[PDB]
RNA sequence: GAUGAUG
RNA sequence: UAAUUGCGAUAACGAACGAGACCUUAACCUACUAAAUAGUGGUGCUAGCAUUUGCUGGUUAUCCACUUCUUAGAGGGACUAUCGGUUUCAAGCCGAUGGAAGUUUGAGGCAAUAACAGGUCUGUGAUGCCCUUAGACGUUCUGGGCCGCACGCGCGCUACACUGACGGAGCCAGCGAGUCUAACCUUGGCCGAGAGGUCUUGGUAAUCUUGUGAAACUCCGUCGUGCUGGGGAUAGAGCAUUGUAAUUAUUGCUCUUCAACGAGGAAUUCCUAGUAAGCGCAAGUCAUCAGCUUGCGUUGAUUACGUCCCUGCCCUUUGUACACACC
């Protein structure tokens, strides 16, 4: 139990993967602003990257930040178990990937496009904008737009 | 054989079997010292029988209790009642009457539950509701 | 303003449309031998001491 | 046939619906009430 | 209650229980009102308030005021009740309990 | 007088023993401690990523002491928790079998526990010596 | 505020001792510092003897000025 | 309520006109006589019948009672 | 075979079993006897036997399209 | 010869006549036994709606059937067990005997 | 001793 | 009076059903008859810590004795007994001591006469009549649907956070259920992050699963008034179980996505103590799936002990052009 001073080099915001990340927020939960990084992906990334979780987001040095970005962009390279990733056995390549930043939304628009051209039931349902997962639409989800 | 006595107490489904015998002041609940009873906040309930009479009366006796059933709160009420009853049953058999009467007077004047169990028992649920006397909401339109 | 205290010496039966009031006879602690009839809001027995904000009012009744 | 609603039938009226299977009675609810006295199920509380 | 009492004796150097009894005795509204009417039109009437009810309603105002303060507020529950009790026994208008005692009495006087 | 494990609060004993095992460093750590979460019911991994494992070992060592025999099943029940399930209400969900198994395997190697007939583990002679020595240490530090 | 600089640090050491009652919340509104930092400050000042605890409880900390 | 029914009032009435000498002013004794004097089908009813009889002996002590 | 044996035994007090008399009505009414004659026949036989009360109710299309219930009774019966 | 005599039924009075007959029959022969161990009663239940068609206020009904198992241990020669198994036939009671 | 039509 | 329950009055006298009685269940018994398929103590063997004769434990093939706790069978007990008030002073009402228990001791089951054109011919090999009776409305087989969504409603479950969320420790119930024309409840060891897989084992049951080591709860920490580490709806990606077969995802696991919701308008529902309310477990349904229902326990308040204002019920008196009966 101790308290120490800090020099004014603290930077309040910082751009990772082209998405500003708050500085006044602990690093574990501050990196969640980057789309594709959830609470448990950050919890693992910081520890695989040897970062003092107890320090706030803006208390990380530049060399630390670049470490997090690299580890996070090719997670398997640093022994991040395959099942953590958000995409596995890609339908078009066979490789495992974790999607970050803008690639999240872009890939989603890809999948819906793939189904639509395939003309499979899921694709038709999205085109019409209705619930896809089989939910009853008689009494729910009316004023959605 | 060593002088001894047995008693018990209850509240809801809790039952505490207290075994007493002449000794050197040992007092133990479930094989641990009385001091380690939990939940912490209600510990002075377990102490209550010892204080209301005086720790002197317990110097020549050993009490071992074992409690089962109920929940974390009703048990503490079982324990204190087993200690109160055990002491008065020991004075019933191995000490004069005048002492037994005085000891019962100290407990009764303070909290009747230390000697006599609580009569309250639960009521069955009835169909047409979530509980004993509550009912489902009713609708007309 | 001051306050005055009186003591209930009888209960004269419930009043109010819905039964929420009680009719009582009081007895002033000081200058006793003066008794007024007035109304109460909650449970009340004999020997209860009331704090009347004003003294010279006397209470209506259903009869 | 190895399972499901249709694998079973009331042992009295061959009805598929309402069947009570506890204790292996295999009788429908309407038929249980009529026969309870003879089966040994009495009404106490 | 354990935390709140400890706090009170820190903040005042008076017996914490005494604060509770003083605050209650300063909060029970002496004069109240009831609805009286016939056929549907309704007007209030002035009535007195019994001893038992002054305590019952006193505690209600105290815990209700403390609880509303603790909501969406950094101060923990134990404190808001501690400051509510300190003020009320002080007869201070800052207390939520005393504010409401005066409001009820004022309406009771206008309807005599 | 003497001392038994039952003479010291559970919280005091568990903290003292977890520190001791951490210091001696003769207990095996399964390696994936930094990844897994101790029960499916949880939604985040344990906070004390350094010493949560030595903490679990401290509890289970005592738990055998109090009882006769236990198993992976008893420990899944013991450390189970309430799932959230979002919109739908809660329900008891058992803990993680892998952790509670590899703690039991680890304990025998350091010599605190042995298998027993009837199934399940059992406090060994050595384990009692280990747990009671420390017990007297915790009480002695009441200052 | 989260990161405390000498301006915000010496302020604590000079104003805490006069308080009648100090706790997690009191240090968050008298001088602007988050609740988290309020806790480490409490567990530091105590170590140096500037405040005396009345009772220590996980979700409620109660201290006072030292004597 | 504690209002007895006619099956109790009449049964006690029959006992007094046939067994006044043997009844006493004591419940327990009257409880045992009603077992030797009348055939009753329950412990509950037997208690009630004897209880009223005791009550009637008290009345007759102070003065005769109509009926 | 040979383990289960069936025996017959004439009843005791034929006039005091509800199943027996209920059948007696069914066969009389199938025969063609009027409703009232039959219902009071069972009541009379039950009572003379020694029964302390008998009740018979015959409900249906007794005389016209609309249905109704008839009651016949003798003595006294309890209900609770 | 060691025997266990488990008895069961749905009506106690009969179960008591047969069981009490067992202890008196054995005690006049001055055998050694463990008195009738009365096991807890087990109560069955069937809760069902009263209505046969699904209309009207929601009302439920509960039924019950009870079982009164006992067992008695004896130590007696063979010549006497032969008739012990043949005595005490009473409707509504089921009896089973296990040797050794 | 407010108001209160209709099938 | 809870009561057409009684006191009485009296052109009525004596009777019958209903209520009460009755039965079930819950609370007491150091009193009777027993009980390793329940428990307790003593002694054998025995681990650990101190050591003066101690504290806590293990041992089902080691034995002995016993019945406070546990099961029952048969009984006892409460009747408002006793006492003080109050009424023609009768039925009773108010209070008090004692007692396990003094609102009919609490909770139920049963439950009258007369009706409804209430619900069911989709429970019935219960039926009248009418229809149909072989390119069938019969029986069965494959594939869909009862889930389709511009909207309106009635039962509900998550929440809107510090009386908190999250992570480690603490650690306690009762009601139940479980394998024939057969695979059921499942311990234990091993494998996997999880789900789950695999080899054995106990139980046709006070013996095993099962102390059902359940949840809320407590203790210590991370968070710090910020749509925020509250909330997890809506979507993507993989991994598994049950089933011939899951796509219109049955369900379960894992990472990603992270919307409405800042305490809710007129209106309106339930409740008088172990009750409301909070928290979950067994059963019914079941191959699979609870946000349902029937029960069970665990933690446990505030506010009346009244009234006829609103909504309705019962009895008498009185008016009526109502009888389909104030619609």
Curated annotation (Swiss-Prot), chain D:
Modified positions (Phosphoserine) in chain numbering: 14
Protein's cellular compartments: Cytoplasm
Chief localization: cytoplasm
Keyword Zinc: yes
Keyword DNA damage: no
Binding, Zn(2+): 10, 13, 28, 31
Known cofactor(s): Zn(2+)
Keyword field: Cytoplasm, Metal-binding, Phosphoprotein, Ribonucleoprotein, Ribosomal protein, Zinc
Function field: Component of the ribosome, a large ribonucleoprotein complex responsible for the synthesis of proteins in the cell. The small ribosomal subunit (SSU) binds messenger RNAs (mRNAs) and translates the encoded message by selecting cognate aminoacyl-transfer RNA (tRNA) molecules. The large subunit (LSU) contains the ribosomal catalytic site termed the peptidyl transferase center (PTC), which catalyzes the formation of peptide bonds, thereby polymerizing the amino acids delivered by tRNAs into a polypeptide chain.
Misc. comment: Present with 6490 molecules/cell in log phase SD medium.
Complex and partners: Component of the small ribosomal subunit (SSU). Mature yeast ribosomes consist of a small (40S) and a large (60S) subunit. The 40S small subunit contains 1 molecule of ribosomal RNA (18S rRNA) and 33 different proteins (encoded by 57 genes). The large 60S subunit contains 3 rRNA molecules (25S, 5.8S and 5S rRNA) and 46 different proteins (encoded by 81 genes).
Protein name listed in UniProt: Small ribosomal subunit protein uS14A
Name of the gene: RPS29A
Parent sequence residues shown: 12 to 56 of 56
Curated annotation (Swiss-Prot), chain H:
Family listed: Belongs to the eukaryotic ribosomal protein eS17 family.
Physiological role: Component of the ribosome, a large ribonucleoprotein complex responsible for the synthesis of proteins in the cell. The small ribosomal subunit (SSU) binds messenger RNAs (mRNAs) and translates the encoded message by selecting cognate aminoacyl-transfer RNA (tRNA) molecules. The large subunit (LSU) contains the ribosomal catalytic site termed the peptidyl transferase center (PTC), which catalyzes the formation of peptide bonds, thereby polymerizing the amino acids delivered by tRNAs into a polypeptide chain.
GO annotation, biological process: cytoplasmic translation; ribosomal small subunit assembly
Source organism superkingdom: Eukaryota
Provenance organism: Saccharomyces cerevisiae (strain ATCC 204508 / S288c)
Molecular-function GO terms, alphabetical: structural constituent of ribosome
Name assigned to this protein: Small ribosomal subunit protein eS17B
Residues of the full protein shown: 2 to 68 of 136
Miscellaneous comment in the UniProt entry for this protein: Present with 30500 molecules/cell in log phase SD medium.
GO cellular component assignments: cytosol; cytosolic small ribosomal subunit
Subcellular location: Cytoplasm
Subunit structure: Component of the small ribosomal subunit (SSU). Mature yeast ribosomes consist of a small (40S) and a large (60S) subunit. The 40S small subunit contains 1 molecule of ribosomal RNA (18S rRNA) and 33 different proteins (encoded by 57 genes). The large 60S subunit contains 3 rRNA molecules (25S, 5.8S and 5S rRNA) and 46 different proteins (encoded by 81 genes).
Curated annotation (Swiss-Prot), chain I:
Effect of residue 28 to E: Impaired ability to rescue stalled ribosomes
Protein localization: Cytoplasm
Highest taxon above the source species: Eukaryota
PTM annotation (Omega-N-methylarginine): residues: 66
Positions of post-translational Phosphoserine modification: 17, 49
Cross-linked residues, Glycyl lysine isopeptide (Lys-Gly) (interchain with G-Cter in ubiquitin): 26, 52, 61, 71
Subunit structure of this chain's protein: Component of the small ribosomal subunit (SSU). Mature yeast ribosomes consist of a small (40S) and a large (60S) subunit. The 40S small subunit contains 1 molecule of ribosomal RNA (18S rRNA) and 33 different proteins (encoded by 57 genes). The large 60S subunit contains 3 rRNA molecules (25S, 5.8S and 5S rRNA) and 46 different proteins (encoded by 81 genes).
Misc remark: Present with 146000 molecules/cell in log phase SD medium.
Annotated function: Component of the ribosome, a large ribonucleoprotein complex responsible for the synthesis of proteins in the cell. The small ribosomal subunit (SSU) binds messenger RNAs (mRNAs) and translates the encoded message by selecting cognate aminoacyl-transfer RNA (tRNA) molecules. The large subunit (LSU) contains the ribosomal catalytic site termed the peptidyl transferase center (PTC), which catalyzes the formation of peptide bonds, thereby polymerizing the amino acids delivered by tRNAs into a polypeptide chain.
Family per similarity comment: Belongs to the universal ribosomal protein uS3 family.
Protein name: Small ribosomal subunit protein uS3
Taxonomic source organism: Saccharomyces cerevisiae (strain ATCC 204508 / S288c)
Gene: RPS3
Span covered, complete protein: 81 to 160 of 240
Swiss-Prot record, chain J:
Biological process annotations from GO: cytoplasmic translation; maturation of SSU-rRNA from tricistronic rRNA transcript (SSU-rRNA, 5.8S rRNA, LSU-rRNA)
Organism encoding this protein: Saccharomyces cerevisiae (strain ATCC 204508 / S288c)
Family affiliation: Belongs to the universal ribosomal protein uS10 family.
Subcellular location as annotated: Cytoplasm
Function recorded in the entry: Component of the ribosome, a large ribonucleoprotein complex responsible for the synthesis of proteins in the cell. The small ribosomal subunit (SSU) binds messenger RNAs (mRNAs) and translates the encoded message by selecting cognate aminoacyl-transfer RNA (tRNA) molecules. The large subunit (LSU) contains the ribosomal catalytic site termed the peptidyl transferase center (PTC), which catalyzes the formation of peptide bonds, thereby polymerizing the amino acids delivered by tRNAs into a polypeptide chain.
UniProt keyword annotations, A-Z: Acetylation, Cytoplasm, Isopeptide bond, Ribonucleoprotein, Ribosomal protein, Ubl conjugation
Upper classification of the organism: Eukaryota, Fungi, Dikarya, Ascomycota, Saccharomycotina
Cross-link (Glycyl lysine isopeptide (Lys-Gly) (interchain with G-Cter in ubiquitin)): 2, 13, 82
Protein name (Swiss-Prot/TrEMBL): Small ribosomal subunit protein uS10
């Amino acid at each position: 139990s101790l308290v120490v001073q800090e020099q004014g080099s603290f930077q309040h915001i910082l751009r990772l993967l082209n998405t500003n990340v708050d500085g006044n927020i602990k690093i574990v939960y501050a990196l969640t602003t980057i789309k594709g990084v959830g609470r448990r992906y950050s919890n693992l990334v910081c520890k695989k990257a040897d970062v003092d979780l107890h320090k706030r987001a803006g208390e990380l040095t530049q060399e630390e930040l670049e470490r997090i970005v690299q580890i996070m962009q090719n997670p398997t390279h640093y022994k991040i178990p395959a099942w953590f990733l958000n995409r596995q056995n890609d339908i078009t390549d066979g490789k495992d990937y974790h999607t970050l930043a803008n690639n999240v939304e872009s890939k989603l628009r890809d999948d819906l496009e793939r189904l639509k051209k395939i003309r499979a039931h899921r694709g038709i349902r999205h085109f019409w904008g209705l619930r896809v997962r089989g939910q009853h639409t008689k009494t729910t989800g009316r004023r959605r737009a | 054989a060593v002088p001894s006595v047995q008693t018990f107490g209850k509240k809801k489904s809790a039952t505490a079997v207290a075994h007493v015998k002449a000794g050197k002041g040992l007092i133990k609940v479930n094989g641990s010292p009385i001091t380690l009873v939990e939940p912490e906040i209600l510990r002075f309930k377990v102490y209550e029988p010892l204080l209301l009479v005086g720790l002197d009366k317990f110097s020549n006796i050993d009490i071992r209790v074992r409690v089962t059933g109920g929940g974390h709160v009703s048990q503490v009420y079982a324990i204190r009642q087993a200690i109160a009853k055990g002491l008065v049953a020991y004075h019933q058999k191995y000490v004069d009457e005048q002492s037994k009467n005085e000891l019962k007077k100290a407990f009764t004047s303070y909290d009747r539950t230390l000697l006599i169990a609580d009569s309250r028992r639960p009521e069955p649920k009835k169909f047409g509701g979530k509980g004993a006397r509550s009912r489902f909401q009713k609708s007309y339109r | 303003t001051p306050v005055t205290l009186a003591k209930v010496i009888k209960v004269l039966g419930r009043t109010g449309s819905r039964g929420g009031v009680t009719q009582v006879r009081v007895e002033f602690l000081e200058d006793t031998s003066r008794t007024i009839v007035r109304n109460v809001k909650g449970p009340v027995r004999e020997n209860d001491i009331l704090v009347l904000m004003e003294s010279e009012r006397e209470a209506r009744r259903l009869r | 046939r190895r399972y499901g609603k249709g694998s079973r039938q009331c042992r009295v009226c061959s009805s598929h619906t309402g069947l009570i299977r506890k204790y292996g009675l295999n009788i429908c609810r309407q038929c249980f009430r009529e026969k309870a006295n003879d089966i040994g199920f009495n009404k106490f509380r | 209650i354990k935390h709140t009492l400890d706090i009170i004796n820190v903040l005042t150097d008076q017996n914490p229980i005494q604060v509770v009894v003083d605050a209650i005795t300063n909060t029970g509204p002496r004069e109240d009102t009831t609805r009286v009417g016939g056929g549907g039109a309704a007007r209030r009437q002035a009535v007195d308030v019994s001893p038992l009810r002054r305590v019952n309603q006193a505690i209600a105002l105290l815990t209700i005021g403390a609880r509303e303060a603790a909501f969406r507020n950094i101060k923990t529950i134990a404190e808001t009740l501690a400051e509510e009790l300190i003020n009320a026994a002080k007869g201070s208008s800052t207390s939520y309990a005393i504010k409401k005692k005066d409001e009820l009495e004022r309406v009771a006087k206008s309807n005599r | 007088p003497g001392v038994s494990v039952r003479d010291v609060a559970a919280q005091d004993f568990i903290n003292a023993y977890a520190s001791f095992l951490q210091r001696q460093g003769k207990l095996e750590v399964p390696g994936y401690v930094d990844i897994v979460k101790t029960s499916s019911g949880n939604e985040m991994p344990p906070q004390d990523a350094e010493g949560w494992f030595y903490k679990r070992a401290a509890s289970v060592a005592r738990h055998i002491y109090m009882r006769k025999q236990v198993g992976v099943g008893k420990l899944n029940k013991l450390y189970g928790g309430a799932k959230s399930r979002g919109v739908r209400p809660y329900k008891h969900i058992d803990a993680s079998g892998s952790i509670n198994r590899k703690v039991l395997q680890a304990l025998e190697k350091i010599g605190i526990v042995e298998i027993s007939p009837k199934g399940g583990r059992r406090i060994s002679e050595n384990g009692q010596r280990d747990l009671d020595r420390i017990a007297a240490q915790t009480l002695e530090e009441d200052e | 505020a989260v990161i405390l600089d000498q301006e915000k640090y010496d302020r604590i050491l000079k104003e805490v001792p006069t308080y009648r009652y100090v706790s997690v919340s009191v240090l968050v509104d008298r001088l602007k510092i988050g609740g988290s930092l309020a806790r480490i400050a409490l567990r530091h000042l105590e170590k140096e003897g500037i405040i005396k605890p009345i009772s220590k409880h996980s979700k409620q900390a109660i201290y006072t000025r030292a004597t | 309520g504690r209002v007895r029914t006619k099956t109790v009032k009449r049964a006690s009435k029959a006992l007094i006109e046939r067994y006044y000498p043997k009844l006493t002013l004591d419940f327990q004794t009257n409880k045992r006589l009603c077992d030797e004097i009348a055939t009753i089908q329950s412990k509950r009813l037997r208690n009630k019948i004897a209880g009223y009889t005791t009550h009637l002996m008290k009345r007759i002590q102070k003065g005769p009672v109509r009926g | 075979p040979g383990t289960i044996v069936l025996y017959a035994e004439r009843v005791q007090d034929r006039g005091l079993s509800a199943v027996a008399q209920a059948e007696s009505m069914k066969f009389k009414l199938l025969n063609g006897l009027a409703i009232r004659r039959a219902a009071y026949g069972v009541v009379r036989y039950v009572m003379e036997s020694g029964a302390k009360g008998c009740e018979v109710v015959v409900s249906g299309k007794l005389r016209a399209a609309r249905a109704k219930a008839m009651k016949f009774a003798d003595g006294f019966l309890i209900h609770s | 010869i060691k025997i266990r005599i488990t008895l069961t039924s749905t009506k106690v009075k009969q179960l008591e006549n047969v069981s009490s007959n067992i202890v008196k029959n054995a005690e006049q022969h001055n055998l050694v036994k463990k008195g009738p161990v009365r096991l807890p009663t087990k109560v069955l239940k069937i809760s069902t709606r009263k209505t046969p068609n699904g209309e009207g206020s929601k009302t439920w009904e509960t039924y019950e059937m009870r079982i009164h198992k006992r067992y008695i241990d004896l130590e007696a020669p063979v010549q006497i067990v032969k008739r012990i198994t043949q005595i005490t036939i009473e409707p509504g009671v089921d009896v089973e005997v296990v040797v050794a």
